[PDB]
Amino acid sequence: SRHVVICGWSESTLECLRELRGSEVFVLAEDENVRKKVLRSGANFVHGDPTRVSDLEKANVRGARAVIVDLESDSETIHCILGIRKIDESVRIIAEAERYENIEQLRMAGADQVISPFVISGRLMSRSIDDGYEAMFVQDVLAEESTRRMVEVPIPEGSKLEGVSVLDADIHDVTGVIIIGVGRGDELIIDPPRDYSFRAGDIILGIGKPEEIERLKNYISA
């Protein structure tokens, strides 16, 4: 597919570059001494300032399919998002929020999805006082080393499940995939009710072993 631009170099973008092996990744950062670690991670390095529109352009923000923005502070992230939305109004921007108060300003500035690692970490630290099964669940289903994988299985056009409710479908009973939520557009319904009718173009968010994912994919086929 098309290339991916990463604005800023930190630990979040380091793990994102670890899971994005194979694709074309350009890294735009100010430090000249991070070129060796960007190239050892298998990505191209572009020396520049990510808040400038000229240097933003140099990294080919127009032709990218997603831009990942993680700079030093929230103000620089909002400024870089405003620059990218000045250049291209249709590209996908994924941003990282350091404070909880700035998620609304990051969404109004033009980010297509805002991720808050300190809010997630604070909620997991507050929830792991009694016993930490939520943090174990999150950190184990995000890893590509366990047996159960959380995948998005799209509903094709003309499928066998067009218009059927969740109760009559029985996806967990046949396929063995735990259906934790179903998504439409930019919205997600976690634990969907029983009178929810499936529509064409939906995204099923599920957890299961890979042969269960194959049986689910063969079950919802055209």
Question: CB of 218: closest distance to its own copies in angstroms?
Answer: 19
Interaction between residue 83 and its own copies (CB under 8 A): yes
Nearer to Ca ion, 110 or 176 (CB): 176
- Which span sits near its own copies by CB under 8 A: 141-149, 155-163, 213-221? 141-149
Measured between alpha carbons, how far is 59 from 50 in angstroms, rounded to an integer? 9
**Residue 50 backbone dihedrals phi, psi, to 5 degrees:** -70, -10
Cα–Cα dist 81/69, whole Å = 8
Tally of CA atoms within 13 A in the half-sphere of 148 that contains its CB: 13
User: Is 57 labelled a binding residue?
Assistant: no
175's contact among Ca ion, its own copies, none, with CB below 5 to 8 A by partner kind, is none
Distance CA 221, CA 192 (A): 21
Angle at 68 between CA 65 and CA 75, to 5 degrees: 135
Calpha distance 178→190 (Å, rounded): 12
Q: Which pairing describes strands 178-184 and 187-190: parallel, antiparallel, or unpaired?
A: antiparallel
CA 149 to chain CA centroid, Å, is 15
Binder to its own copies among 12, 44, 60, 165 (CB under 8 A)?
12
Residue 70 labeled ligand binder: yes
Tell whether residue 130 is a contact of Ca ion (CB under 5 A).
Answer: yes
**Does residue 180 bind its own copies (CB under 8 A)?**
yes
- When CB distances are held under 5 to 8 angstroms depending on the partner's kind, the choice from its own copies, Ca ion, none that residue 111 binds is none
For 26, the token pair is 């350009």
**x-marked contacts with its own copies along 187-206 as a string, rule CB under 8 A:** -x-xx-----------x-x-
Choose, by CB under 8 A, the member of 31, 39, 62, 65 that binds its own copies.
65
Check residue 117 for interaction with its own copies (CB under 8 A): yes
Decide: is 145 part of the binding site for its own copies (CB under 8 A): no
- Segment interacting with its own copies, rule: CB under 8 A, options 65-73, 155-163, 214-222: 65-73
Nearest residue to 101 (alpha-carbon basis) of 123, 113, 119: 119
* Residue 98 labelled as part of a binding site: yes
Task: Output the known binding site for Ca(2+).
Answer: 70, 96, 98
